[PDB]
Each structure stands twice: as C-alpha cells, then as structure tokens.
Amino acid sequence: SSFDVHKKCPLCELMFPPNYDQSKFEEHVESHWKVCPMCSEQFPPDYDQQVFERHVQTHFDQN
Ligand SMILES: [Zn+2]
Ligand SMILES: [Zn+2]
Numbered sequence: 001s002s003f004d005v006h007k008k009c010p011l012c013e014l015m016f017p018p019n020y021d022q023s024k025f026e027e028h029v030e031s032h033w034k035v036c037p038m039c040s041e042q043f044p045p046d047y048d049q050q051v052f053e054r055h056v057q058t059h060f061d062q063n
Helices: 022-032 049-058
Strands: none
Touching: none
16 A cells, blocks of 8 residues: 555656655656747647747747
C-alpha cells in the first residue's frame, strides 16, 4: 500500500513522483506550450497557432 499521488501532465503521458516539485511540473507542462523566443511569451496548447505565429513572426519584422 502507498499514496498514488502521481502528477501526470495532461500535455503528455509522463508520470511524476509525489516528491516532484510543482515548479518543475509547471516548467514541464509549460514546455509543451507554445512559447515565443523573441520575447518569452507563453501560449496554451488550445491557443491558435496562427495567432502565435503572428506574434512570434511579429518579432522578426521589427527589432
Ligand atoms: Zn507534460
Ligand atoms: Zn514574442
């Protein structure tokens, strides 16, 4: 017997131990999210790639 409090990231199929730091989970979960490298913005998986690409691309048409 033991606590099965395994945190599973909805974005993937990976199971994390109960001693897993939430902060690390946030980063992992966010890792799957669409993030702009020109400013460092986070875009949810449900977001529209068109809007994201426009935002990221917006960073290429202006320095
Ligand atoms: Zn994940
Ligand atoms: Zn950006």
